[PDB]
């Protein structure tokens, strides 16, 4: 009967915190703790730049920062009392709309006629053309909200499940075997909750696919 | 009445997670036939299987979040 | 002319050999024998 | 003087990236609608 609370403290200090977790030394040889960060950055950058292979690869140097930021913010939430900034819908809403708008306006800046012609899937039955067009434009307008929700909802749900099962364990003053089993379930869930990085990958990869489709 | 609505709405909403269970079952099953046809388990065969499991689990937990909101 | 060029090349080789110092150098310092390029260069 | 570090990237990708004005307009309209509810 404990009310879940994703409270709103002074956001700026919490949000800026993951940035300080990555130092950038100006040395030929790094500090064997930024080195792993650099290697991960290169490994992910290769995967992200493989698909584009265009002049839009300039966007990749910002998408790397995007994926690093989202991953750092979401991975830090697994701590006992950490407040996930991505739990709040505000910042993810403020991230999904501008980037989708950037993708569509970049598409409309160069080869604009063909960018709008991407609605045409090279012909398709003419009898159902208006239905297909309205479906695809409604999907395109859905895409930003979809991108925001597919991050916010499950990021909140992980913490919600952790809180629920933890409260169940704490309230379980009964047979200790059941308590131990529920604690094992908790640890298994938290190991699964570490897959929030896969959510970062999904978000950034969907954004990359949209940008590549429109550019 | 309102508490009864909370209970019935939660009981309904939690039934929507069954489709995500079917999806994770389907993808993890397809994992095994992909492995059988091509013994490259450590590769994208298992990487994208994990990706699909995470995506469907997201589709299920993002559903049960509504039930959690209804209950509280 | 070739002897002058050879003297220049020998001086450059000696400078490269001496300037190696410690492997823990600076990123900008490594540009002496290995610099980067302008924008739109690192395709991969 | 951190502006010059990413000044080229700023106007390089914000030609369409700096459309956060749309986000600000949407947020302001939503806040006005909620204040009408409020």
């Amino acid at each position: 009967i404990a009310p879940t609370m994703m409270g709103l403290p002074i956001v700026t200090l919490i949000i800026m915190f993951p940035s300080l977790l990555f130092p950038t030394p100006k040395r030929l040889i790094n500090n064997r703790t930024i080195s792993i960060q650099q290697w991960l950055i290169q490994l992910t950058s290769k995967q992200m730049m493989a698909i584009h292979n265009q002049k839009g690869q300039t966007w990749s140097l910002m998408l790397m920062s995007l994926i690093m930021f989202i991953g750092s913010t979401n991975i830090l939430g697994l701590l006992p009392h950490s407040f996930t900034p991505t739990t709040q819908l505000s910042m993810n809403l403020g991230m999904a709309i501008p980037l989708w708008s950037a993708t569509v306006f970049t598409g409309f800046r160069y080869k604009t006629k063909t960018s709008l012609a991407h609605f045409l899937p090279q012909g398709t039955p003419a009898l159902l053309i208006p239905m297909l067009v309205i479906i695809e434009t409604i999907s395109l307008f859905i895409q930003p909200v979809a991108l925001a929700v597919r991050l916010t909802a499950n990021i909140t749900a992980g913490h919600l499940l952790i809180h629920l099962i933890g409260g169940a364990t704490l309230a379980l003053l009964n047979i200790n075997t059941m308590t131990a089993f529920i604690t094992f379930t908790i640890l298994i869930l938290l190991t699964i909750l570490e897959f929030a990085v896969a959510l970062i990958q999904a978000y950034v990869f969907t954004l990359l696919v949209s940008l590549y489709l429109h550019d | 009445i309102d508490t009864a609505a909370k209970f019935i709405g939660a009981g309904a909403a939690t039934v929507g997670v069954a489709g995500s269970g079917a999806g994770i079952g389907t993808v993890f099953g397809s994992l095994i036939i992909g492995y059988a046809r091509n013994p490259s388990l450590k590769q994208q065969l298992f990487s994208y299987a994990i990706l699909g499991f995470a995506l469907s689990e997201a589709m299920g937990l993002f559903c049960l979040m509504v039930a959690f909101l209804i209950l509280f | 002319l070739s002897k002058a060029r050879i003297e220049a090349y020998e001086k450059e080789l000696e400078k490269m050999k001496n300037i190696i110092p410690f492997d823990q150098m600076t990123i900008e310092d490594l540009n002496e024998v290995f610099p980067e390029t302008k924008l739109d260069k690192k395709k991969y | 003087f951190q502006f010059t570090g990413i000044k080229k990237y700023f106007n390089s990708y914000t030609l369409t990236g700096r459309m956060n004005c749309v986000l600000a307009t949407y947020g302001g309209i939503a806040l006005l609608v909620l204040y009408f509810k409020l």
């Binding site: 940035s19 140097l61 920062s65 809403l93 403020g94 | - | - | -």
Partner: peptide
């Protein structure tokens, strides 16, 4: 609990984006 308001949460993220991209621009392969 439920997200409301949406004023300053969506404002600090742009500054953090600036900071993160400036930081990672120094990173190189």
């Amino acid at each position: 609990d439920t997200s409301t308001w949406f004023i300053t949460i969506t404002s600090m993220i742009m500054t953090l984006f600036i900071l993160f991209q400036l930081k990672i621009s120094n990173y190189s392969y």
